Predict the structure of chromosome segregation SMC protein.
Amino acid sequence: YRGFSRAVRAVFEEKERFPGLVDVVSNLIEVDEKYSLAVSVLLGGTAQNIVVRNVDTAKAIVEFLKQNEAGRVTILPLDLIDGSFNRISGLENERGFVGYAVDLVKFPSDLEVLGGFLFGNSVVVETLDDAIRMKKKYRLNTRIATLDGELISGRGAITGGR
Amino acid sequence: GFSRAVRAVFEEKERFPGLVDVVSNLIEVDEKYSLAVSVLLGGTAQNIVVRNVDTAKAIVEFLKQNEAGRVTILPLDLIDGSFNRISGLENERGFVGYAVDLVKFPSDLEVLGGFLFGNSVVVETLDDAIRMKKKYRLNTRIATLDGELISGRGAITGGRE
């Protein structure tokens, strides 16, 4: 169920009320179908984040949602988000290395900061084995996704059990 | 009130002497700050705290057999609770306090506070949150009394359900 939450729906229903509103992340991303599964898992729920021009628009949306109890949303003000990231020396030499997710996705020129913010130094590789191997060789805490849509990360704490 | 997996673990506590409790049951905080704390904790609120990796592995194995479900475990011996304060921040208008100072954990679980909140801060309003973040170029999370959250990288979460 990937439909927009009712909070997001509510915001755009009265988009006029917010001039600095740009769009939801999913509608701004441009990527080749080949990388769609990997990019999608890297994005996760941030696909529904609301991109706005400035903090005032963000504030206006929050106040709006608050007084209408229409739910919660996550907003990315272009003037506030940090899109900085550092590539990891040597990863490009790894077997199965496809590329940094930021290099596999395009946004309209004036929104380049989004790539950096959304993907940081996340990496895309051909297969899970490549992912596991890379994470070990470089003790990466960075997120790594496969062309199949699988994802691994620095992992916060020990999880599992099933 | 928790997941079947978490419930199995605790109803079988006698098997894990290294078992402590769920993060949410260990939090002691003034009602005024509960909303802010809740947003800062996010999903870690249901993490299971144990004293060592062994207890962690035992529980995982345990859950792997009875197939009750999955859980996230925080071994007190592995988690890093270090963090650094930001000089002058505490003198800013709207500053309520570092979350780590507002939340109380039992004496032998101090490290939990540092690991769960780091140098995250609680401020009065979203307006205060944005101003302080810019003024100090904060890269840590900020929560407001109303329950808004500004991620370390500038993402703003707000609204009411």
In short: The radius of gyration of chain A is 17 Å. Chain A is about 35% helix and 20% strand. Helices of chain A lie at 6-13, 25-28, 33-43, 55-68, 101-104, 113-119, 128-137.
